[PDB]
Amino acid sequence: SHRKFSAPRHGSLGFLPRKRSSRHRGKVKSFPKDDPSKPVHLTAFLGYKAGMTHIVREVDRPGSKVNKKEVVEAVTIVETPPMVVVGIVGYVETPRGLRTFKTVFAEHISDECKRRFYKNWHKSKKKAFTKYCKKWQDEDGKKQLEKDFSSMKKYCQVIRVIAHTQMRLLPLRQKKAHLMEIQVNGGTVAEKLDWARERLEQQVPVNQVFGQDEMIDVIGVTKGKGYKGVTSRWHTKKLPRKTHRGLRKVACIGAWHPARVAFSVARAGQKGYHHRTEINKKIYKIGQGYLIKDGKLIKNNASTDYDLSDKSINPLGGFVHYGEVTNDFVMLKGCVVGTKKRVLTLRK
Amino acid sequence: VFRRFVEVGRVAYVSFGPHAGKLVAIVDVIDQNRALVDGPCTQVRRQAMPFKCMQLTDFILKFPHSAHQKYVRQAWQKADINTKWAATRWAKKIEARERKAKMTDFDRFKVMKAKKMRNRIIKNEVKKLQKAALLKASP
Amino acid sequence: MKTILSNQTVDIPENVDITLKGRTVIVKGPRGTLRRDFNHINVELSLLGKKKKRLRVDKWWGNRKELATVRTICSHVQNMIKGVTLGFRYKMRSVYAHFPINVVIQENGSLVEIRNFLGEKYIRRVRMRPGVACSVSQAQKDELILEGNDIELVSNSAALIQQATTVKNKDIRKFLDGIYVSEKGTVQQAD
Amino acid sequence: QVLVLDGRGHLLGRLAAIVAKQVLLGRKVVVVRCEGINISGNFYRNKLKYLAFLRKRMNTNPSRGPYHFRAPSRIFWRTVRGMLPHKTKRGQAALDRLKVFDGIPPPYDKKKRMVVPAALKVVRLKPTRKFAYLGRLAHEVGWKYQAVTATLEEKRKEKAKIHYRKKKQLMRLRKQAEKNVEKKIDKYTEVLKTH
Amino acid sequence: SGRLWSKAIFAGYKRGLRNQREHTALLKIEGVYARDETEFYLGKRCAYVYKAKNNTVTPGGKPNKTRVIWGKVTRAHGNSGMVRAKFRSNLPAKAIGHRIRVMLYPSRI
RNA sequence: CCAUCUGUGGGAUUAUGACUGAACGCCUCUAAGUCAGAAUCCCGCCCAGGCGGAACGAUACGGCAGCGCCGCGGAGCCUCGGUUGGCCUCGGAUAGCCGGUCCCCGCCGGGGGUCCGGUGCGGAGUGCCCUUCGUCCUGGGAAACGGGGCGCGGCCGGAAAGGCGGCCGCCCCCUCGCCCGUCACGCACCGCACGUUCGUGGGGAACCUGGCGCUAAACCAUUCGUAGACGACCUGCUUC
RNA sequence: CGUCGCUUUUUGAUCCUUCGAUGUCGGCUCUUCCUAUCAUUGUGAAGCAGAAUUCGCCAAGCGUUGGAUUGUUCACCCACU
RNA sequence: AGAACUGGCGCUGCGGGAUGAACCGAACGCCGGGUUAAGGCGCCCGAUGCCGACGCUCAUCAGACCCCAGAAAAGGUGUU
Ligand SMILES: [Mg+2]
Ligand SMILES: [Mg+2]
Ligand SMILES: [Mg+2]
């Protein structure tokens, strides 16, 4: 009764079902709430982390001792080829929540969207959306496909955009695109819907969505550590050496009279591979990667104004376990959720 | 707002109770929720009726406060309430509500057949106004 | 007790003409118009008489604490005659020791921006209820004036300045600092 | 078939006591627009006794345990639930003839709705005593659908003021259409036996 | 060519709070909600018509999946115009809330 | 924490200080009515997603089969419950409802004078159908739209769960689709129950069946190692 | 000087349950709860000049340590806060 | 803890007091009709679904039925 020595709870009860997440791609639980006074734009973007390096910069901060000095910072880099817009979704507001009004997919769909719609692309007849593409071309389907835009414009009030990644531009093995569904936050819902009818089956680069020295969120699934014990999943103290039947255990897991173990106690199970959101990650640099062949291959990444040397941001020997970054990138100050080669969704 | 008050002489109807459906005249109030009334020409004599049992009308009577039975009776008929009561639209509603209540099985047949005949004639002459309405709005 | 009725009457001058929607009272006068709704108070409002315009508020039956509320009707009504024919004006002065209290007005009377309250770096932007406006006075030091038609919108807004200039963590028996009201008057006088 | 009860202006337990007796007897009852249910006593008192209900929570895990619903359709549903023998199959079916809604759905915005004079606030409260709306004691505690409901109601009520526009357009017409002539022979026997 | 029976529903059995007497039902005949106006319905023959999957009929001579339990109205029950009534079998308790069928037989009127 | 990075705002208010203002001719933070208001509280952010819904993709050839859609009639199996529908203003309550000259908001709606009714009769103590046995002969009142449609085609109306509704053009058709009267017959089954509807309800299984359509995808094995105690999870497997 | 109460973290008093057995101190480890609030938020009162204290209010959200002697609970001291 | 008188429980179900040894009604063969006792009649749950009568009371800790399962001194220009 009354521990004689106060100490706080180990771990947070706000992440309490420490469970293998039901998704490999990070899910945006909440897009930024908008007003229609802003110009029309995207809000989220898929990317793959390659690895980390560090950096040197002349930090301007009056008051601090950091002022006008060179200070190193850990940076991750995230390889982001441009997305390609496929679909438009409409959500109608209800007294039970948002509800998908209907979807319109693009006139002709890529190879790597269609691979995401199968569990065995080898055994498949590669038949998805084959009858759906023939309602863009017949006269009767075309007048009731553009009727589904005019009914979308009338009723539903937040619209989103189905876009996928171009896995062909990436050193990975996967070749299934990751199919995200991201909210446009423009002005009125007529301009918000005409901005996406303009630009189906087209590329959307990463500099068009984000900006330099701007601060975003990172959503992904963590490094999976497996089935781990009490003292590693929950950072519980080890018992002394003299303890019979074990060191790495929590000793008491409840009183008598609540005759029942509580959810608030620590016990062993799956550690890692959890869906998490890091907040307030600053973008340090928007990359542009391996441009035109007139000058045969300008590498030119990581070549600052104070460097002026033909360098490229992929390190000497390549990124470990990842490959070799030939595309656009966003580099973020600090650590970022996930293993290398893992899909992580950047978000304003 | 509050167009009819209780008052010495205010002729009230009686909704429920053992004198239901007959009129009274408020002669005197006793305390806050009961009133001494009588009907001299409508067969409900002098007694205390509660206010939630009675039912105020628009008829007043001019007789002195807490008079006898005779001077209410003279005031009841110098004003001629019982003729003037039955020629009002609410004494006709209470009469018609008990004409329908005593409508027998043969009479309810006749009320049926002579209702669907006139509902045709009103539905013809209200649809011959719908055609006449668009022809006005065609120019 | 549950008494037989009480009533107050309100004598109404000719330059103000009152209509009523019900327990709503519409008061129109020279310097504008203002309305209140008394749909919570369970009374009847009858404006009687030609050429004289008397307003009689009477509550039938009623308990003793609902007898106390018929006078509150006629007192709010007289402050609508007064406010629409004469206006309300609360003159507040700045009482201060060593530190002068600097006061300006940002937006058209709707914002009062107090600074240097007892040597402080933190500003105090007090926005006002719509319908009142401010004025730095003339021929008197450190005074602020508030004018409007509704007494509850003048006086509540007068209380937002007097609450904002509040000394914390100190003795308030000394350190008499703030912008307190000094007078309760009208915009047009002697009528 | 089914009685459709418009829930506003009613009290919580007086309405729920009549529904929980009509639904053991085999009727289907649809309570609509539960946002407008009153509940007697001032608002701060009714909001305290719902926050005292929220701390009722079984210690070892709250995931099993008392399910504190937040929409007023389900607050009223759980009030009816506590007046029914819901642990028997005669009472399981009794909860299943009750479709309580929130707002007024498209099947029920075009049916005639009844009220219950045995549970109305005007009838059953003395007017100098205070009451709480179930709409904003739901909103103060965790319900997130008040503004998207009021938006849809003022679009619902605007589509019915044009319905009631043209309904009394016909009533003006057929009162002037019954002015005309020669149906006096049929009015001889209907005025005689309550026109 | 028309309904010739009053509409009732079977509400429950004659019970105290704990123990119930299965031998008499109690019924809520519709439209009558006062004890003074149930004197018409005393002695009327009430019936519980239900379905099965075997076959039986009396009048036509060709059987169907319909069968019935016959009863009669005994006396009034309470002030609210409901009625207790005793059949020739006992009610199945499946019928709690379902209708029964109150005819216009053995009527003085 | 032995290296490094990140930790986020809205609401109603407690205490308390007030405003207007009675009771109690003044006064009063309170009695009705308003305000400011916080490590609390509730939500957002964040984590899990229900015997909770949604939008959409493609839907089984082969060599015979196979499966959706529409229109069918035929017989039998299982679950039983109901005996006509109301197709809708907002709401106030010490107040409401209707009809209407004039002053204004893209030929509708808001304001006021004016007239009504009002224990609601433009009354769900109600209203429309109807309690319609059918038919024949044979006259009056009404009635010039025809009304049931498996017709055909077009329109726009209804996103909170639209799955429902309104209108029009041509068409096989009726001229009895109502009320009053005339003439006379149909199982009149000989006093008797489960009658009379919803209804060519729902679910399952096959046969005779005309037309229009469709030709897949999961799981295992193998692979991977962003994952794992085992299942699960993430991937590859084109004749280049 | 009185006098009315609460509480069951003191100790008794009693002997109801347990004698075909409910493992009996302390510490360590760990979770939750209470408020009769030490500190932190917002406040009212001082014999509140300021600083520092003191006494009440809403309030259990969040904290309430490192050691020497002692088997200690308790104690007592050093030091940080 | 220990006595006096009477009843009860132990040996005893049943209706009620939500729950129950002892309270309150009433004691019991197997059943049908009737009527009550104590207690009740918004809904669990039989019965007030009476057009019940007169008053009192507002609680930001309301009150709510013998035994009986929670309160006192003191105080209130809260209301009667
Ligand atoms: Mg969300
Ligand atoms: Mg840690
Ligand atoms: Mg006794």
UniProtKB/Swiss-Prot annotation, chain A:
Q: What is its main location?
A: nucleus
> What are the Basic residues biased-composition ranges?
17-30
Tell me one GO molecular function of this protein. structural constituent of ribosome
Question: Key word Cytoplasm present in the record?
Answer: yes
Q: Which cellular component, as a GO term, is one annotated location?
A: focal adhesion
Q: Name one Pfam family in it.
A: Ribosomal_L3
Q: Where is this cross-link: Glycyl lysine isopeptide (Lys-Gly) (interchain with G-Cter in SUMO1)?
A: K293
Post-translational modification summary for this protein = Constitutively monomethylated at His-244 by METTL18. Methylation at His-244 regulates translation elongation by slowing ribosome traversal on tyrosine codons: slower elongation provides enough time for proper folding of synthesized proteins and prevents cellular aggregation of tyrosine-rich proteins. It is not required for incorporation of RPL3 into ribosomes.
For the modification Tele-methylhistidine, the affected residues are H244
- Indicate where the modification N6-acetyllysine is found in the sequence: K135, K285, K293
PROSITE patterns, per database record = RIBOSOMAL_L3
Q: Which Gene3D superfamilies match?
A: 3.30.1430.10, Ribosomal protein L3, domain 3, Translation factors
Per its UniProt entry, which superkingdom is the organism in?
A: Eukaryota
Modification Phosphoserine occurs at = S12, S303
The covalent link annotated as Glycyl lysine isopeptide (Lys-Gly) (interchain with G-Cter in SUMO2) occurs at K38, K223, K225, K285
> Which GO biological process entries does UniProt record here?
cellular response to interleukin-4; cytoplasmic translation; translation
Cross-referenced InterPro entries = L3_arc_euk, Ribosomal_L3_dom_3_arc_sf, Ribosomal_uL3, Ribosomal_uL3_CS, Transl_B-barrel_sf
Recite the UniProt keywords alphabetically: Acetylation, Cytoplasm, Isopeptide bond, Methylation, Nucleus, Phosphoprotein, Ribonucleoprotein, Ribosomal protein, Ubl conjugation
The record's SUPFAM superfamilies line, in alphabetical order, gives:
Translation proteins
User: Does the keyword field hold Protease?
Assistant: no
Region feature (Disordered) = 1-36
Functionally, this protein is described as follows: Component of the large ribosomal subunit. The ribosome is a large ribonucleoprotein complex responsible for the synthesis of proteins in the cell.
- Quaternary structure (record): Component of the large ribosomal subunit. Interacts with DHX33.
Please report which protein family the annotation says this sequence is part of: Belongs to the universal ribosomal protein uL3 family.
For this entry, the protein name equals Large ribosomal subunit protein uL3
Q: Which organism is it from?
A: Homo sapiens (Human)
From the UniProt record, report the name of the gene that encodes this protein.
RPL3
Curated annotation (Swiss-Prot), chain C:
Any one GO MF term held by the record is: rRNA binding
GO BP: any one term: translation
Localized where? Cytoplasm
Cellular component GO terms held in the UniProt record:
cytoplasm; cytosol; cytosolic large ribosomal subunit; cytosolic ribosome; focal adhesion; membrane; nucleus; ribosome
Q: Note the SS bond partners.
A: none
Is Plastid one of the keywords UniProt gives this record? Answer: no
List, alphabetically, the InterPro entries matched: Ribosomal_uL6-like, Ribosomal_uL6-like_a/b-dom_sf, Ribosomal_uL6_a/b-dom, Ribosomal_uL6_CS2
| Superkingdom to which the source organism belongs | Eukaryota
Record keywords = Acetylation, Cytoplasm, Ribonucleoprotein, Ribosomal protein
Keyword presence, Acyltransferase:
no
What quaternary arrangement does the UniProt entry report?
Component of the large ribosomal subunit.
The protein's job, in short, is: Component of the large ribosomal subunit. The ribosome is a large ribonucleoprotein complex responsible for the synthesis of proteins in the cell.
Family as reported in the entry's similarity comment = Belongs to the universal ribosomal protein uL6 family.
What is this protein identified as?
Answer: Large ribosomal subunit protein uL6
Q: Gene name, please? A: RPL9
From Swiss-Prot, chain D:
List GO BP terms, alphabetically: cellular response to type II interferon; cytoplasmic translation; homeostatic process; lung morphogenesis; macrophage chemotaxis; negative regulation of formation of translation preinitiation complex; negative regulation of translation; positive regulation of natural killer cell proliferation
GO: which molecular function terms?
A: mRNA binding; RNA binding; structural constituent of ribosome
Effect listed in the UniProt record for changing S73A: Loss of interferon-gamma induced phosphorylation
SUPFAM superfamilies, sorted: Ribosomal protein L13
Alphabetic keyword roster: Acetylation, Citrullination, Cytoplasm, Phosphoprotein, Ribonucleoprotein, Ribosomal protein, Translation regulation
Under the heading CDD domains, the entry gives:
Ribosomal_L13
Report the locations given in the UniProt record: Cytoplasm
| Family affiliation | Belongs to the universal ribosomal protein uL13 family.
Which purpose does this protein serve, as stated in its record?
Associated with ribosomes but is not required for canonical ribosome function and has extra-ribosomal functions. Component of the GAIT (gamma interferon-activated inhibitor of translation) complex which mediates interferon-gamma-induced transcript-selective translation inhibition in inflammation processes. Upon interferon-gamma activation and subsequent phosphorylation dissociates from the ribosome and assembles into the GAIT complex which binds to stem loop-containing GAIT elements in the 3'-UTR of diverse inflammatory mRNAs (such as ceruplasmin) and suppresses their translation.
Please state what the protein is called.
Answer: Large ribosomal subunit protein uL13
UniProtKB/Swiss-Prot annotation, chain E:
Q: Where in the cell is it found?
A: Cytoplasm
Q: Any additional notes? A: Knockdown of RPL35A in hematopoietic cell lines results in decreased cell proliferation, increased apoptosis, decreased biogenesis of mature 60S ribosomal subunit, and abnormal processing of large ribosomal subunit rRNA.
Residue positions where N6-succinyllysine is found in the record: K62
* N6-acetyllysine modifications at: K7, K62
Q: What is this protein called?
A: Large ribosomal subunit protein eL33
Highest rank taxon of the organism: Eukaryota
Any single Gene Ontology cellular-component annotation: extracellular exosome
Spell out the subunit comment.
Component of the large ribosomal subunit.
- Coiled-coil region list: none
The reply on keyword Zinc is: no
Keywords on this record? Answer: Acetylation, Cytoplasm, Diamond-Blackfan anemia, Disease variant, Ribonucleoprotein, Ribosomal protein, RNA-binding, tRNA-binding
User: Membrane-spanning residues where?
Assistant: none
- Which InterPro entries does this chain map to? Ribosomal_eL33, Ribosomal_eL33_CS, Ribosomal_eL33_sf, Transl_B-barrel_sf
Which SUPFAM superfamilies does the record associate with it?
Translation proteins
Q: Which Gene Ontology molecular function entries are recorded, alphabetically?
A: RNA binding; structural constituent of ribosome; tRNA binding
Record's family? Belongs to the eukaryotic ribosomal protein eL33 family.
- What are the recorded Gene Ontology BP terms? cytoplasmic translation; ribosomal large subunit biogenesis; rRNA processing; translation
What is the native source organism of this protein?
Homo sapiens
What is the stated purpose of this protein? Answer: Component of the large ribosomal subunit. The ribosome is a large ribonucleoprotein complex responsible for the synthesis of proteins in the cell. Required for the proliferation and viability of hematopoietic cells.
